[PDB]
Design a protein around this ligand. Structure first.
Ligand code: NI
Length: 531
């Protein structure tokens, strides 16, 4: 209560708040959750944080309905420190095209707009950097990386930058593709970040620390050599080559969780060895509230400060007491437990099939539509399990096919990828081309592209499959299945338009660490997060 400095965090009770509070306590502070305006008073609050995720209107409505507008404004007028995160920062603007009818606190008189997806994938999911400038603040370092996950942003141009300057605002800029946007803002006692510091490893913790301590450390004296190596060259739109570490979560004979301190320690190890993200593949008469996978996330979230994804089990379920819990709420539970993204599998295929059946339209009942409308496309990833099928010509199937470089058994020069469901035990008559385009239309923000035929092989990724999917959709595509050695990552990043690469057994077996891969990619002129 007064034995350590207390930090007040406004909680609209939606999304992952585990990481932020764990980050604050890790820094030696006591967290005080404010769910109601009654939970805090101006004079007794010295450090306030406004975190937010998901749909703009969804967040701001929740915020002002609970009665936080006046309290927030009064706190700001007192001159005391406030920090906004993600939607917390966008809540400072006039509003957002994302939610046409929503109004913001309007400290910055323009609205957030969506990134241009004709030249790059949207949402932006990855590690971007702050453009070098004389007016940076709170230790933001151009040579370090921060994690961004959003579709909308305060996109800048010459006029807006000048107006902000004359307005007395200090801006930390970033660029994704050809678009320049606001990475962070600072004016008097207001500080806000578009990226998630609690998801940005050590670099992120530093930013939270500098804010809590009200300090703007000078950036390290990097050698011209180090700068040229750590600087953003705007390859891959300005995002580093994202390396994901994946692990399975099973229930053994005795009922314990295995690959509950095993899945937890391995995720910690992955994190410590440089993983940019940790994905848990959940393959498990237990009540939803007591699902052991949820404890794994919660425990992992105490020290792993990078995004966490969980696949498997995120669907409509009937609890032990017969309660009907829809996908959306099951997801909310994993999110509040430490998860940042949820991977949909089998349902994705059903949803896509229905989509085409309805004449290429969604009816809003799929887990993809519900979770994404609440948390944003960035919170939903589609796990696809496809396998190559050869045909003599586009005429042998209704699905989209492409001319392959590797002829089939009978000399077939064309093929399509047939999707499966239920852990790849059952195939459907839907190509990966159609599955991904439908899911994207339904609101998915990213594709986790597995490949049955390469899975477990350790001989590299199916390169034509990656290109086939990149031709189909505009959302980020993750290369999965086949990774064995660092060179496989190099090949995907240089020979294909893959937006990220996932590795499983190679990291689990200790053959290579994420750092080994990063060191190798780094040695080959690729940009990678190093923290
Ligand atoms: Ni105390």
């Amino acid at each position: 209560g007064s034995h350590m400095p207390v930090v007040h965090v406004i909680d609209v009770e939606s999304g992952n708040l585990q990481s932020l509070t764990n980050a604050i306590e890790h820094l030696g502070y006591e967290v005080q959750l404010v769910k109601s305006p009654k939970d805090f008073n101006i004079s007794g609050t010295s450090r306030l944080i406004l975190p937010g995720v998901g749909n703009y209107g969804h967040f701001v409505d929740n915020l002002f309905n609970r009665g936080f507008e006046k309290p927030i404004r009064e706190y700001i007028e007192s001159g005391k420190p406030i920090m906004g995160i993600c939607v917390g920062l966008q809540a400072l603007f006039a509003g957002s095209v994302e939610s046409p009818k929503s109004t913001g606190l309007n400290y910055i008189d323009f609205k957030l707009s969506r990134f241009d997806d004709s030249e790059k994938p949207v949402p932006e999911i990855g590690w971007n950097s702050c453009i070098p400038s004389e007016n940076l603040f709170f230790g933001l370092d151009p040579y370090k990386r921060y994690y961004f996950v959003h579709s909308f942003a305060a996109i800048l141009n010459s006029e807006k930058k000048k107006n902000l300057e004359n307005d007395g605002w200090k801006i930390a800029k970033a660029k994704y593709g050809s678009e320049e946007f606001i990475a962070a803002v600072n004016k008097n006692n207001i500080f806000a970040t578009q990226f998630h510091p609690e998801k940005s490893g050590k670099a992120g913790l530093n930013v939270i620390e500098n804010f809590l301590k009200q300090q703007s450390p000078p950036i390290p004296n990097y050698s011209a050599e180090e700068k040229e190596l750590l600087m953003n060259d705007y390859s891959n739109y300005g995002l580093t080559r994202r390396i994901i570490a994946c692990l399975d979560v099973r229930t053994n004979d005795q009922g314990d969780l295995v690959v509950l301190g095993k899945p937890v320690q391995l995720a910690q190890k992955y994190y410590q060895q440089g993983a940019d993200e940790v994905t848990f593949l959940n393959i498990t008469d237990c009540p939803l509230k007591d699902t052991p996978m949820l404890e794994v996330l919660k425990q992992a979230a105490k020290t792993v400060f990078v995004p966490l994804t969980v696949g498997g089990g995120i669907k409509d379920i009937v609890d032990v007491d017969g309660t009907k819990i829809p996908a959306l709420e099951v997801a909310s539970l994993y999110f509040r437990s430490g998860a940042d993204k949820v991977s949909i599998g089998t349902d994705a295929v059903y949803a896509a099939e229905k989509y085409y059946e309805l004449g290429n339209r969604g009816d809003g009942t799929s887990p993809i539509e519900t979770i994404s409308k609440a948390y944003g496309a960035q919170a939903v990833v589609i796990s696809v399990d496809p396998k190559r099928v050869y045909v003599n010509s586009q005429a042998d199937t209704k699905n989209k096919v492409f001319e392959t470089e590797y002829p089939g058994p009978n000399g077939e020069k064309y093929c399509w990828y047939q999707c499966t469901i239920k852990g790849g035990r059952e195939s459907r008559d839907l190509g990966v081309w159609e599955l991904t385009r439908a899911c994207e239309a339904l609101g998915a923000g990213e594709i986790l592209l597995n490949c049955i035929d390469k899975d477990g092989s350790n001989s590299g990724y199916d390169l034509e499959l990656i290109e086939h999917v990149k031709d189909a959709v505009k959302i980020p595509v993750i290369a999965s299945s086949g990774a064995g050695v660092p060179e496989h990552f190099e090949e995907a990043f240089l020979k294909t338009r893959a937006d990220a690469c996932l590795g499983a057994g190679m990291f689990h077996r200790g053959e290579f660490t994420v750092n080994d891969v990063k060191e190798y990619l780094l040695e080959h002129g690729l940009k990678v997060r190093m923290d």
